[PDB]
Amino acid sequence: AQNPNCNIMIFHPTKEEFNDFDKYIAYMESQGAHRAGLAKIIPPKEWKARETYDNISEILIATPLQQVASGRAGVFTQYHKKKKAMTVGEYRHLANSKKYQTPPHQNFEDLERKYWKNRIYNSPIYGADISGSLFDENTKQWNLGHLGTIQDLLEKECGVVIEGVNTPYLYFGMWKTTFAWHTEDMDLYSINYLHLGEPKTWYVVPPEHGQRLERLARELFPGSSRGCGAFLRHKVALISPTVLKENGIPFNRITQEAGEFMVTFPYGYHAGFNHGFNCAEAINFATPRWIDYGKMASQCSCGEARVTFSMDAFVRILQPERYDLWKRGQD
Ligand SMILES: O=C(O)CNC(=O)C(=O)O
Ligand SMILES: [Mg+2]
Ligand code: NI
Ligand SMILES: [Zn+2]
Numbered sequence: 001a002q003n004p005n006c007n008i009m010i011f012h013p014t015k016e017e018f019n020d021f022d023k024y025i026a027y028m029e030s031q032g033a034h035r036a037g038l039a040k041i042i043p044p045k046e047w048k049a050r051e052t053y054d055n056i057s058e059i060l061i062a063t064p065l066q067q068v069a070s071g072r073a074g075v076f077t078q079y080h081k082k083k084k085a086m087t088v089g090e091y092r093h094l095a096n097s098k099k100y101q102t103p104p105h106q107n108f109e110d111l112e113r114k115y116w117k118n119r120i121y122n123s124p125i126y127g128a129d130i131s132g133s134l135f136d137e138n139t140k141q142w143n144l145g146h147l148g149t150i151q152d153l154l155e156k157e158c159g160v161v162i163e164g165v166n167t168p169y170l171y172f173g174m175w176k177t178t179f180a181w182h183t184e185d186m187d188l189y190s191i192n193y194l195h196l197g198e199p200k201t202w203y204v205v206p207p208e209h210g211q212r213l214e215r216l217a218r219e220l221f222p223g224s225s226r227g228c229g230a231f232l233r234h235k236v237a238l239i240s241p242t243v244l245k246e247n248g249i250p251f252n253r254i255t256q257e258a259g260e261f262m263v264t265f266p267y268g269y270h271a272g273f274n275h276g277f278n279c280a281e282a283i284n285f286a287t288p289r290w291i292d293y294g295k296m297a298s299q300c301s302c303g304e305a306r307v308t309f310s311m312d313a314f315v316r317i318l319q320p321e322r323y324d325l326w327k328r329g330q331d
Contacts, residue, residue, distance in 0.1 A: 001032070002030070002032030002035075003031065003032025003033065003035045003036065004032070004035070006035040006036045006037070006206035006208070006209075006250065006252070007036055007252065008036045008038050008039065008040065008204065008252045008253075008254045009028065009031065009033045009036060009039050009040070010039070010040045010041075010042065011024075011028055011033070011039060011040065011041045011042065012042050012044075013043070013044060014044055015044040015046045015047065015141075017044075018043065018044055018047060018141045018142060019141055021141075021142060021147065021148075022148070024041075025189075025263070025287060029289070033263075033265070034265040034266075034268075034289075035206055035207070035208065036204060036206060036252060036265075036268070037204040037205055037206050037207050037252075037264060037265050037267075037268025037270065038202060038204040038252070038254065038262060038263070038264050038265070038268055038270060039262065039263045039265075040254060040256065040260060040261070040262055041142075041260070041261040041262070041263065042259075042260055042261075043141075043142065043259065043260075043261065047139075047141055047142070048139070049134065049135050049139055049143075049193065049195060050134060050136040050139065050195075051136065053134070053195065053196050053279075056088050056134070056279070057087060057088050057092065058087060058088070058089070059087065059088040059130070059132070059170070060085060060086075060087055060088075061085060061086055061087070061088060061091055061127035061130060061172060062130075063082050063083070063085070064083040064084070064085070064086060064091065064125045064127050065080040065081065065082060065083070065125065065126045065127075065128055066081040066082075066083055066123045066124075066125050067079075067080060067081075067123055067124055067125070067176075067177060068080075068081055068123045069120040069123070069238075070120075071120065071238075072120070073116060073117060073118075073120050074116065074239065074240035074242055074243040075220050075238070075239055075240070075243055076119075076120050076237075076238050077221070077224075077236045077237055077238070078178060078180060078236055078238065079236065080126075081123075083125060088127070088172055088279075091125070091127055091172055091174075091277075092172075092277050094125065094174070095173075095174035095175070095276065095277035096277060100124060100125070100174050100175060101175060101276070102175040102198065102275055102276040103175075108199065108201070108255050108275075111275060112201060115176060115201075115273050116240045116241070116242065118176075119176050119178065119238075119273070122176055124174050124176040124177045124178070125174060125177070126171070126172075126173060126174070126177040126178070127170075127171065127172035127173075128169075128171050128172075129169050129171070130169060130170040130171070130172070131167055131168075131169060131170075132168070132169070132170050133167075133168050133170075133281060134170065134195050134279070135281070142193075142261065144168045144191060144193060144281050144282070145167070145168050145283075147166070147191075147283065147285055148285070149165070149166040150164075150166050150188065150285060150286040150310070150314070151163075151164050151165070151166065151310070151313070153285075153286040153287065153288070153290075154286070154291075154314070154317065157288050157291055158291070158317070160317055162313040162314075162316075162317060163310075163313055164308075164309060164310030164312070164313050164314075165309075165310060166283065166284065166285070166310065167283070168281050168282065168283040169281065169282055169283065170279060170280070170281055171278075171279065171280040171281070171282065172277075172278070172279050173197075173198075173200070173274030173276075173277065173278045173279070173280070174274060174276065174277055175198075175275065175276050175277075176274070177273065177274045178238065178271075178272070178273045178274075179235075179270070179271055179273070180235045180236050180237050180238055181213065181217070181232055181235075181237050181238065181239060181269055181270070181271040182232055182235045182269065182270065182271070183210070183264075183266075183267050183268065183269055183297075184264065184266075184284055185284065185307055185308070185311050185314075186293075186294045186297045186311060186314045186315075186318075187266045187267045187290070187293040187294060187296070187297040188285065188286055188290060188293075188294070189263060189264060189265055189266060189284065189285050189286065189290060190263070190264040190282055190283070190284050190285070191261060191262070191263050191264075191282065191283060191285060192256070192261065192262045192263075192264075192280055192281070192282040193260075193261050193280065193281050193282070194256050194257065194258045194259065194260055194261075194262075194278060194280050195258065195278075195279045195280060195281060196258050196278065196279050197258055197277045197278030197279055198258075198274065198275040198276030198277060198278045199255050199257050199258070199274075199275045199276075200255070200256045200272055200273070200274050200275070200278065201253065201254070201255045201256075201272050201273055201275070202253065202254050202255070202256060202270055202271075202272040203241060203251055203252070203253050203270060203271050203272055204251060204252055204253075204254075204264070204268055204269065204270045205249065205250060205251050205268065205269040205270075206250055206251075206252075207265060207266060207267040207268050209249070209250045210267050210268075210269050212248075212249050212250070213239075213244075213249055213269050214232065216239070216244075216247050216249055217231075217232055217237060217239065220237075220243075221237055224236075224237070227302055228300055228301075228302040228304065229298070229301075230298035230299055230305075231300070231302075231304075232269070233299070233300035233305040234300065234304045234305055235305075238271060239271075241253065258278070266289070266290050266293035266294075267293050267297075294314060294318045295318045295319065297319075299315070299319070299322055299326050299329075301322075301325045301326050301328065301329035302329060303329045303330075305329075306330065307330070312330070315327075
């Protein structure tokens with residue numbers, strides 16, 4: 001069995017190997033990459049996502065989210081308070097202000113220590129989940145707006161034709177902005193490209209051990225667990241590496257830098273934080289190997305997780321018993 005310790009693998013495709021996205025994903029899995037839950041892909045040196053970022057300040061962040069924490073430094077939840085709209089130029093200036101900017105630090109490790117010590121005492125503002133793309137239309141390789149759609153994958157594998165669309169999302173981050181522990185909707189893959197700015201640190205639990213993280217989360221967030229049988233779908237809970245290590249939960253960590261892709265694999269729980277002002281683009285995708293994960297994915301029916309239009313069909317076709325109850329949650 002390849003990668004039996006479930007280490008995060010790093011790939012360096014050549015420009016030739018960068019042509020066929022599906023084939024490269026399947027290659028990485030042949031090497032055991034999925035066992036980690038997360039892989040890094042460094043593009044060939046010849047590739048570029050677009051020519052310059054010199055003209056992005058006019059993108060609007062219609063609903064910036066202030067991420068307010070509750071709990072203790074290593075075990076906390078965050079709620080998202082909606083803020084007034086601002087442009088990316090306005091948000092970048094805010095990120096760089098004395099109140100929000102990255103503190104002085106020695107290296108990524110020192111910064112990680114400072115994040116876990118101090119995150120809860122601040123409320124950074126995240127421009128998350130903005131429909132759009134920063135890939136040039138002329139970028140033909142690994143262009144996250146030109147991927148094969150999940151609807152088409154389901155049609156190709158299973159013969160069924162369904163409504164829905166699959167588009168990318170932009171994320172504008174600042175120091176301490178946080179993504180809580182989650183898997184993707186319907187335990188899909190994700191791919192994330194860091195277009196510019198400061199790094200993003202990721203934590204990940206191997207898919208084969210995801211249920212160990214779930215059991216810990218039920219113990220650490222006991223009221224949330226009674227409220228919902230899949231409350232990590234709410235995307236609000238944080239657990240630090242120190243707490244994971246104290247509880248024996250297998251995990252890995254890695255830092256993504258500008259110019260690099262990350263892939264998350266079906267049922268790979270992940271969480272993380274941004275080092276400073278940055279912009280990422282991400283989208284969900286599927287392969288044939290996902291279908292069985294999609295059939296088994298948990299679902300939030302308490303009503304909190306409230307998701308996209310396109311998830312309806314995935315539930316309807318892959319999980320027809322749950323359909324009914326899950327849709328009561330969404331309506
Ligand atoms: O970048 C972020 O804030 C969160 N991204 C993801 O969870 C992802 O790409 O799957
Ligand atoms: Mg602009
Ligand atoms: Ni994710
Ligand atoms: Zn729920």
